[PDB]
Amino acid sequence: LGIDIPNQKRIEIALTYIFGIGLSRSQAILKQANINPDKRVKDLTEEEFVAIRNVASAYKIEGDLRREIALNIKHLSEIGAWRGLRHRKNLPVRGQRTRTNARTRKGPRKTVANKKIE
């Protein structure tokens, strides 16, 4: 479950690359295991790699986040819900304006000639 932690950079960021561990809880793990921040990933003792892996197993599995999010979306969609209906057609959900803006989810662009003004 050790997935491509890059070298020539600190461990604090090395734990930010696995899917589900950002800046904050990586620092929480860092302070929990007594690993010293400022150690670059290279020249790191194995003695504490097992500690990192144990405390991460205490957390949520990094590969399990995708499955949990998909299961939650399916749970929200299988029941008749406006949000599920909104989320199904790739249109923003939290209530952002859709008049002109909010194109980060609707796709790059699809231009159509407007009204033929006279």
Partner RNA sequence: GGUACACGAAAAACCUUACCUAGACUUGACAUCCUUGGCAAAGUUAUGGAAACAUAAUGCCGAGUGACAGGU
Partner RNA sequence: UUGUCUAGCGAGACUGCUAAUGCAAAUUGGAGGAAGGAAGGGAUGACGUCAAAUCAUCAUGCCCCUUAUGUCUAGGGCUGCAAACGUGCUACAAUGGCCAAUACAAACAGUCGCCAGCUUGUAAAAGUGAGCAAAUCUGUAAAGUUGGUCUCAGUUCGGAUUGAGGGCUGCAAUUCGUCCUCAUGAAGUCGGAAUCACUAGUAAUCGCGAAUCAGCUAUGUCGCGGUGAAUACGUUCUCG
Q: Least separation, in Å, of the C-beta of 6 and RNA?
A: 8
Residues from 55 through 94 that contact RNA (CB under 7 A): 65, 69, 72-73, 76, 82-83, 87, 91-94
- 68/114 Cα distance (integer angstroms): 43
- 53 lies in the binding site for RNA (CB under 7 A): no
Q: Could you tell me where the DSSP H helices lie in 4-63?
A: 11-14, 23-33, 49-58
Integer CA distances (angstroms), 47 to 18, 34, 53, in order: 21, 12, 11
- 83 lies in the binding site for other proteins (CB under 8 A): yes
- Which one of 23, 69, 70, 85 is in contact with other proteins (CB under 8 A)? 85
Counting every residue written for the chain, the total comes to: 118
- Report the interface residues with other proteins, using CB under 8 A: 75, 78-83, 85, 112, 115-116
